Amino acid sequence: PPPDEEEQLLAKFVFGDTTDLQENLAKFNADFIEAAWIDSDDEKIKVPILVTNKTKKLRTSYNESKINGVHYINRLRSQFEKIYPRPKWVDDESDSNGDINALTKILSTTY
Amino acid sequence: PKVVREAKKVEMTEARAYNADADTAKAA
Amino acid sequence: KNSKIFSPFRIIGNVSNGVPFATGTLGSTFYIVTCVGKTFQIYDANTLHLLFVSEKETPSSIVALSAHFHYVYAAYENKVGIYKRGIEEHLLELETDANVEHLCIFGDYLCASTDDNSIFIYKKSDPQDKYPSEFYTKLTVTEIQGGEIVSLQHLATYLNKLTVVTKSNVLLFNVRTGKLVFTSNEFPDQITTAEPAPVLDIIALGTVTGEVIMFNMRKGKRIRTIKIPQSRISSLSFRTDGSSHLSVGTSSGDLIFYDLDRRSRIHVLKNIHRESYGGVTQATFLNGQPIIVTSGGDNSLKEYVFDPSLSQGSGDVVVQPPRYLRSRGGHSQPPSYIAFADSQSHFMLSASKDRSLW
Amino acid sequence: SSLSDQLAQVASNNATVALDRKRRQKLHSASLIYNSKTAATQDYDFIFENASKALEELSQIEPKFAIFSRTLFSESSISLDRNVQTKEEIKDLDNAINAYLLLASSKWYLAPTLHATEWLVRRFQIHVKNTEMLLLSTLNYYQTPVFKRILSIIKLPPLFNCLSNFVRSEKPPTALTMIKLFNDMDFLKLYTSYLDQCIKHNATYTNQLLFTTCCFINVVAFNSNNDEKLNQLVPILLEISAKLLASKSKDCQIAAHTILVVFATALPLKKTIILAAMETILSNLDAKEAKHSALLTICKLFQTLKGQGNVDQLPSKIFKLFDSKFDTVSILTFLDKEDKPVCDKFITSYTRSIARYDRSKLNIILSLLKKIRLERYEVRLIITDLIYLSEILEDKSQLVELFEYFISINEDLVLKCLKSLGL
Amino acid sequence: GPYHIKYAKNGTHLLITGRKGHVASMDWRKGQLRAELFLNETCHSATYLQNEQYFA
Amino acid sequence: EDEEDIALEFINGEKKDKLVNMNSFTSMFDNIQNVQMDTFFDRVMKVLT
């Protein structure tokens, strides 16, 4: 049986756990003070892995030795994300009465 | 006294990269 | 017309002539390959010594260069040479009459591009060989899809795809079957420079007006537009230490550093290559190091560094402006007077017509 | 590099660690209120009781400190340490600590805030780990004994060499030395970053903003010589000006007005840049004394504009915007005041804009030119646009009375312009 | 030249000797530097003997 | 008349403006302590002219 709220509270105090304070610092916010082209041969292709160092890195389980194209390229994407990290600008941004940003815009334009 | 600007040394540390010769593959 | 007492030994004292150089990677160091006249040269990246030079002059002047690991791929007028350590290892006789313009090397393939929109594809023979040697196929770029071929790249993670950037649009090719499988939309300007990113499916196009266009390819919808006015953008590169730094090199001789996460102009360098001699023809960040290397057309190869910042906590908002570091180069205009130094024949004085002596 | 220098770097990386009892006594005896021996002897628990009482007083004054009572001032906050945790939790702690210093920036002359900050000092070692936000959030208080105490405690980053000379003495630093500090450049960038975050959390106060604007104005006042330095200083100060106008308080907007006016009279800028700045001011103008300051600085902007196209009209959207935020009777009364800033270039451009754009309020044009005395080339410019408006528009007795006014004042000039074009 | 290492028994003082003349004895933890000597003759091996006060 | 006559009218109609040299600001640092922001602006504009 799982222990109730007071038992939880006394447990955290007497063992001196700090996971509550860590999750509180984690949630701490100063907030308040598809595609468009398909590749038929890529879905048809079957490539091997076990040739050398690189694709033997790309392997995932010990039994598999040949993997077809869509899983293969998806693994390559994962590997590339491992090596080169992803920055937030390309995960988020797109440029899409007079406003406020006009001064900064002309300042970033002119030299 | 102002800020001191001692441009310290540089060492070409190690790096890691990508490889198109394992980007590509062969027909069945 | 042959000689009988003397014989050509080497042409001393040059670094570049404006043809875009390439950077090659060995193990975890780097090196720089450039071209001079009818030969090509290979320099070190940590101390800038002279490591290699070709040993046969070419029947024309070298126009295209790139580098895989050990082998370096050069392309003069009609053939394509595959060199190893400056020793000529292989020819590659192309089957046309045109002149070859740009070059890309990836996978089991070599991709060469002439002037008349003709892309030659060489295939690797067997994957236990090291360079492609068999003729494979010949794609064309019809004028009704896009104009003259500008450059050829290959993005990360695209099975037998090839990226062609033209005057008006971009093309994604599948070289396995041999079909143009994706086209983009016409862009109003003349696209002149191209470079893939260190993130996925992101390419960068540099135009004649000050537009740096950050483009998607999995979607095909130009993500970002950054404006430089009153110049013609001449090359791009990305930093990869872990910051969001982008380096743009104009033809006027300046250099400009933006940040993408801040949309910002971090800094600008002024007159590091003379516009009177072709402008900044190739500027590249070394991969993952705070070292940028620029080479001009004014016979000069420099490399600068970014200083680690002076804040303790803030950091990425207060970035040091770049400083100066190693540099090699020689005369700009052809020299006028020389003389020897001493009876061990060691130093050569020379004064040139751009008003300096070395 | 040499062995001694590399060991010095490792020592700086291990500044905070309390290895032996001598280093513990030293690091502990560094503290804010208490002197040496007593600071050395008293314990975390007694410190924390004093801190909690102080925090209850502070939350009584304003309720934003329940957050820090919940997070940084509890039992696990007694127990924990910086030098044990992983770097990512460390970054979260730096987030919360900087939130604290930002929020307690506006109460620094009170013993309660003094005591709670002594808790942060003597447990989280902030006077050694992250001195930046301490110094910058406590900079403007630069003549007070609390600042003298922080100077006797702290270890400076290599941006602050001026205070690094003034450490551990009996006199507070002087405005000359503060101006040296702000005359540095990377320090200016760091201060912009801090002020950006401060606005985006929306907590500034009057003395803070006043000290910032006085430091910036003296920096540009010194750099009136080196034009290349001013040219490399433009993006910094103007982007802090744009964010400061983006804020929603009368305080922020008026401060940004003063920075803009002194910069515009210190260096001749481009007309389009001037118009963009005016566009921001008008697009975010809200309150009454804000309207007052905005009109004055707009006038001074167009006045210090000098060059070709000095007297050009406002572009259409700008002109609509400006009249909408500035009804005509108000600006009439401001002209009727005694203080009377110089206004000829801006006023002539405004009336030429009303001429080419509005086509109704020629009577107001008449009264403005009645109230203010203008210049010769301006008079010819007004005459030109009125002549063209006559040659296009169906005629009016109001146009008759305006040209009547000019015949009463400078009819030979009028005939000279007709000799240029007409009868 | 190439270096050889001995930590003291308390785990608190590092003793390093290069192959050429370099000998250094350091706290290494709060980065104090007790002793440094540039002996020219080839120093072969080194150790703290009983404390951080006497080393051979 | 001529364009150069227009330019001479323009120049001689261009009035005089106060500049700002290097020590024209210490007075704010004197009395900055407990005064409002708009009154501070009044002081700065008055020092400018």
mmCIF file of N, CA and C in Angstrom, chain E residues 6 10 15-16 26 32-33 37 39 49:
data_model
loop_
_atom_site.group_PDB
_atom_site.id
_atom_site.type_symbol
_atom_site.label_atom_id
_atom_site.label_comp_id
_atom_site.label_asym_id
_atom_site.label_seq_id
_atom_site.Cartn_x
_atom_site.Cartn_y
_atom_site.Cartn_z
ATOM 1 N N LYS E 6 53.716 11.238 -7.924
ATOM 2 C CA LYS E 6 53.423 10.530 -6.689
ATOM 3 C C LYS E 6 52.523 11.404 -5.843
ATOM 4 N N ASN E 10 48.177 11.288 2.266
ATOM 5 C CA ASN E 10 46.955 11.950 2.688
ATOM 6 C C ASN E 10 46.068 12.310 1.518
ATOM 7 N N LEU E 15 53.163 15.496 -5.992
ATOM 8 C CA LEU E 15 54.574 15.663 -6.280
ATOM 9 C C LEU E 15 54.836 15.225 -7.710
ATOM 10 N N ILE E 16 55.339 16.137 -8.539
ATOM 11 C CA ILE E 16 55.617 15.833 -9.935
ATOM 12 C C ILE E 16 57.089 16.040 -10.213
ATOM 13 N N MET E 26 52.990 20.595 -4.708
ATOM 14 C CA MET E 26 51.859 21.504 -4.647
ATOM 15 C C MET E 26 50.723 20.907 -3.834
ATOM 16 N N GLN E 32 47.605 26.160 -3.831
ATOM 17 C CA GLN E 32 48.848 26.673 -3.298
ATOM 18 C C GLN E 32 49.999 25.930 -3.947
ATOM 19 N N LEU E 33 51.165 26.545 -3.883
ATOM 20 C CA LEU E 33 52.363 26.048 -4.538
ATOM 21 C C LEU E 33 53.479 26.059 -3.512
ATOM 22 N N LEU E 37 61.531 23.564 -8.053
ATOM 23 C CA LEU E 37 62.976 23.541 -8.222
ATOM 24 C C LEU E 37 63.336 23.056 -9.611
ATOM 25 N N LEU E 39 66.095 21.601 -11.079
ATOM 26 C CA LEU E 39 67.314 20.832 -11.175
ATOM 27 C C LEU E 39 67.587 20.446 -12.618
ATOM 28 N N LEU E 49 57.822 11.592 1.705
ATOM 29 C CA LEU E 49 58.169 10.476 2.567
ATOM 30 C C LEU E 49 57.189 10.294 3.715
#
